Amino acid sequence: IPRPEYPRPQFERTTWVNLNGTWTYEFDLDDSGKKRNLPTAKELSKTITVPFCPESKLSGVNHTDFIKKMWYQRSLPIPADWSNKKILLHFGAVDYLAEIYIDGRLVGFHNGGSSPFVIDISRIAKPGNSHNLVVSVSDDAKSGRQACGKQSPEKNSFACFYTRVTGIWQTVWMEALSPCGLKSANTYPDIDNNQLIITPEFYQISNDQTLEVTIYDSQKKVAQVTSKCANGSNLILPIKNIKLWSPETPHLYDISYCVKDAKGQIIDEVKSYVGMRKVHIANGKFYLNNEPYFQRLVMNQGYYPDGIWTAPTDEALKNDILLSKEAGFNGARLHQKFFEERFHYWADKLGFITWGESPNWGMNPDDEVASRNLLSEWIEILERDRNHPSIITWAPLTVPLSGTFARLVFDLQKLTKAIDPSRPFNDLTGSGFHFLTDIWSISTYEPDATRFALSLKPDKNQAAYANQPFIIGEFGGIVWEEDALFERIEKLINAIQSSGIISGFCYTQFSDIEQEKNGIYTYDRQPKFEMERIRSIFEKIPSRPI
Numbered sequence: 001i002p003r004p005e006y007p008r009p010q011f012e013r014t015t016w017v018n019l020n021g022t023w024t025y026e027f028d029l030d031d032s033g034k035k036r037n038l039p040t041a042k043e044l045s046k047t048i049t050v051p052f053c054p055e056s057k058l059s060g061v062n063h064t065d066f067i068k069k070m071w072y073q074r075s076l077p078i079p080a081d082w083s084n085k086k087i088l089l090h091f092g093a094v095d096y097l098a099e100i101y102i103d104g105r106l107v108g109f110h111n112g113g114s115s116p117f118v119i120d121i122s123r124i125a126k127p128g129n130s131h132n133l134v135v136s137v138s139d140d141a142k143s144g145r146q147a148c149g150k151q152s153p154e155k156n157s158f159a160c161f162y163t164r165v166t167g168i169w170q171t172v173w174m175e176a177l178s179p180c181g182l183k184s185a186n187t188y189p190d191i192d193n194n195q196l197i198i199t200p201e202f203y204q205i206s207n208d209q210t211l212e213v214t215i216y217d218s219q220k221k222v223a224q225v226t227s228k229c230a231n232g233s234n235l236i237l238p239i240k241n242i243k244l245w246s247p248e249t250p251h252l253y254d255i256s257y258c259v260k261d262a263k264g265q266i267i268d269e270v271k272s273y274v275g276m277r278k279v280h281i282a283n284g285k286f287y288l289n290n291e292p293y294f295q296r297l298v299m300n301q302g303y304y305p306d307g308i309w310t311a312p313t314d315e316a317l318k319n320d321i322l323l324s325k326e327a328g329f330n331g332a333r334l335h336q337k338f339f340e341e342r343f344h345y346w347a348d349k350l351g352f353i354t355w356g357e358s359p360n361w362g363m364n365p366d367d368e369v370a371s372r373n374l375l376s377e378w379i380e381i382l383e384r385d386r387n388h389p390s391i392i393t394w395a396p397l398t399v400p401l402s403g404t405f406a407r408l409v410f411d412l413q414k415l416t417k418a419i420d421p422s423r424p425f426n427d428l429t430g431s432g433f434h435f436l437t438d439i440w441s442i443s444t445y446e447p448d449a450t451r452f453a454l455s456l457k458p459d460k461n462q463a464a465y466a467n468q469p470f471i472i473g474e475f476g477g478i479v480w481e482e483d484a485l486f487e488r489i490e491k492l493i494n495a496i497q498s499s500g501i502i503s504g505f506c507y508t509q510f511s512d513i514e515q516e517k518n519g520i521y522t523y524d525r526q527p528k529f530e531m532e533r534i535r536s537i538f539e540k541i542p543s544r545p546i
């Protein structure tokens with residue numbers, strides 16, 4: 001079974017099934033599948049390896065041309081000892097519109113090709129029996145309604161656009177739990193008050209139901225509290241001598257969640273973790289844990305030669321972060337894609353700061369329906385990723401290459417502040433223009449290093465300018481297939497270093513991708529250059545100044 005690992009490792013139960021592996025599929029050229037009763041089909045015409053999209057080699061299908069409509073199918077065995085449980089069916093992502101059938105009946109649907117969804121099958125699922133699961137998939141970027149990221153709008157890859165991703169591109173899985181279990185737990189690290197706040201949510205709360213929370217440093221229990229179950233009520237976990245999370249020291253505390261019925265019997269157990277860290281802007285600087293922090297970022301566009309949007313293995317996700325740090329970067333912009341959850345896990349574990357962004361390219365910037373679609377995907381991703389210490393900035397919009405766009409800029413700023421005030425917000429990347437931002441990013445690919453140094457200033461005449469930390473969001477981009485190359489990159493880093501007013505940078509980019517040969521690494525993650533040299537250049541500006 002491919003990608004067998006637990007797909008939600010910051011909220012982990014043991015009672016799950018991985019549904020990756022061999023499914024059946026069909027392309028539906030004339031959109032006739034419903035006429036041909038595909039929802040009651042027990043086997044479709046061909047086979048595919050989920051969770052790899054059909055454009056991928058790892059799917060075994062390798063069909064890169066446009067796929068407008070397709071169908072997936074497999075048998076869904078429900079384990080016998082899931083008796084009388086709540087049973088959830090989870091899809092990480094399906095591009096773009098998914099309609100879910102069980103035993104031929106429509107049980108759910110999801111609009112948004114990059115965001116997770118869940119179907120409560122508690123009422124339909126018959127433990128110790130097998131159902132027929134059929135998934136209908138639509139994908140039509142030409143509509144202008146879809147957030148596509150870097151997926152090519154042309155048949156072939158060209159310029160900065162790459163291979164498409166249709167259908168199921170993340171792990172499909174099921175879990176069973178108490179009807180009265182823990183739906184979620186938001187973690188709020190508060191380093192100024194030496195404590196962790198937890199806000200729980202339960203599916204249902206019975207007679208005298210309690211939740212017990214224990215915090216661990218390794219095996220050492222450092223905090224514990226019990227409470228009577230109430231949605232949205234605060235549990236306070238005091239932590240003396242907090243071990244702070246940073247890229248340089250990625251310390252995590254373990255959490256156990258224990259839900260008990262009126263008899264003190266355990267009905268639900270969940271495992272989690274947290275990184276005790278604080279991020280805020282003040283006085284023109286960016287602060288990690290109440291001290292300045294210099295961001296040494298590389299642009300990561302999250303493409304893999306054999307899996308396209310899908311990492312071939314857990315190891316390939318982890319390895320992108322290790323290769324990023326070996327090049328001297330302390331973090332990445334996660335660009336034009338919602339990354340897989342386990343990527344944020346390895347960023348949490350290995351020590352790596354990230355910007356969470358969106359695949360906003362490929363939407364018609366005059367279509368309010370495109371705006372409507374991105375707002376809901378964005379909410380789903382904030383819900384999915386809000387507990388990750390590695391994410392230290394949200395940046396949901398890159399300018400594309402008519403106030404609908406300006407309206408969406410302000411709506412995402414207000415929505416994101418309301419959902420998550422813990423992280424700085426960057427309203428707009430890829431230009432020098434801002435509407436309302438915590439972060440003053442600019443983009444400069446000026447090849448001449450004298451002209452480059454002079455481009456290194458914010459436009460303070462813009463109404464939005466309010467002494468925000470100044471970040472070079474995009475620079476470099478040097479195309480390659482040596483000493484000459486190293487000089488060029490070193491000249492840019494020294495100009496940034498000499499500036500005295502810059503809070504961080506992001507180098508374009510981590511790896512080559514198809515025709516774009518502007519990575520530090522090849523597309524198959526091989527060094528292009530003497531790594532000792534690369535690292536000594538990109539590491540020159542320290543994480544912690546002076």
Ligand SMILES: [Mg+2]
Nearest residue numbers: 003004005171
């Ligand atoms: Mg997995």
Ligand SMILES: [Mg+2]
Nearest residue numbers: 013015016175
């Ligand atoms: Mg589970």
Ligand SMILES: [Mg+2]
Nearest residue numbers: 052053307310
């Ligand atoms: Mg894939």
Ligand SMILES: [Mg+2]
Nearest residue numbers: 091092093170
């Ligand atoms: Mg999926």
Ligand SMILES: [Mg+2]
Nearest residue numbers: 093094113115
């Ligand atoms: Mg989806």
Ligand SMILES: [Mg+2]
Nearest residue numbers: 101102103104
């Ligand atoms: Mg069915």
Ligand SMILES: [Mg+2]
Nearest residue numbers: 141144145146
């Ligand atoms: Mg579109």
Ligand SMILES: [Mg+2]
Nearest residue numbers: 146147373374
């Ligand atoms: Mg969308």
Ligand SMILES: [Mg+2]
Nearest residue numbers: 139164165166
């Ligand atoms: Mg596509």
Ligand SMILES: [Mg+2]
Nearest residue numbers: 050052053168
């Ligand atoms: Mg697939």
Ligand SMILES: [Mg+2]
Nearest residue numbers: 304305306307
């Ligand atoms: Mg690969």
Ligand SMILES: [Mg+2]
Nearest residue numbers: 003005313314
């Ligand atoms: Mg995995």
Ligand SMILES: [Mg+2]
Nearest residue numbers: 114337338359
């Ligand atoms: Mg995406």
Ligand SMILES: [Mg+2]
Nearest residue numbers: 344347354390
């Ligand atoms: Mg991350």
Ligand SMILES: [Mg+2]
Nearest residue numbers: 145146147373
């Ligand atoms: Mg959209």
Ligand SMILES: [Mg+2]
Nearest residue numbers: 392393424439
């Ligand atoms: Mg930032």
